[PDB]
Design a binder for this molecule. Structure first.
Ligand SMILES: [Cl-]
Ligand SMILES: [Cl-]
Ligand SMILES: [Cl-]
Ligand SMILES: [Cl-]
Lengths: 125, 125
């Protein structure tokens, strides 16, 4: 039986994403685990200018989707959430029955690591 | 090909070792990696009493060997070293061409993680 069943990858959209993506794909396939994906984004509204929240979200959505598409993850298992990375990472992991969180170091990594209720894989970038 | 080739397990000889041992055995076997093992021990000599350095080392050696024997690791790949855990863990990993260090949390974990030149798997105990 599989040593981990459900691996959550956290990506930050750096140029080094691709190393981690292929590694995590090889990982999950060799051990038989399913993958989910999350990226954490990353008060006065300016009145003299057009806001670009939706366009900015679309860029993020595309980057998430580049990665999601490579990994064959259903959009239902791709997460783009507002908030503090550590907290949001850990809340999705709990909610979604993850048993391995994967993060890159380069922080967020060290905070997820100190508060996660499951194993954490920190991948050197 | 194997996502990791050489996994170094670090054990501290707590009652929770066995969970980590079987997990790491299942891990390495599913991905095709070889295992090494390390435990880091863990100025005036008393003149009125017998010292027990050798007996104390034998106890540690037995505990290392319980774990090593389970995992089928040659004694050549089992390490019982004097020193600061973080430093010694990282020095063996470098020396021995490790590409995944495994540690339990419960520290040492967070220090190995902040200075390791390879991926680190932190296993919740
Ligand atoms: Cl993130
Ligand atoms: Cl805006
Ligand atoms: Cl140790
Ligand atoms: Cl002594």
């Amino acid at each position: 039986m599989s040593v981990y069943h459900h691996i959550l990858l956290a990506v930050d959209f750096s140029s080094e994403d691709s190393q981690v993506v292929q590694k995590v794909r090889n990982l999950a396939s060799q051990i038989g685990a399913r993958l989910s994906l999350i990226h954490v984004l990353d008060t006065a509204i300016p009145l003299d200018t057009e806001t670009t929240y939706d366009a900015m979200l679309d860029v993020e959505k595309q980057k998430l989707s580049q990665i999601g598409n490579t990994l064959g993850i259903d959009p239902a298992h791709r997460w783009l959430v507002w908030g503090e990375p550590r907290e949001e990472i850990i809340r999705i992991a709990e909610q979604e029955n993850v048993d391995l969180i994967v993060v890159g170091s380069h922080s967020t990594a060290n905070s997820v690591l100190h508060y996660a209720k499951c194993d954490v894989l920190a991948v050197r970038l």
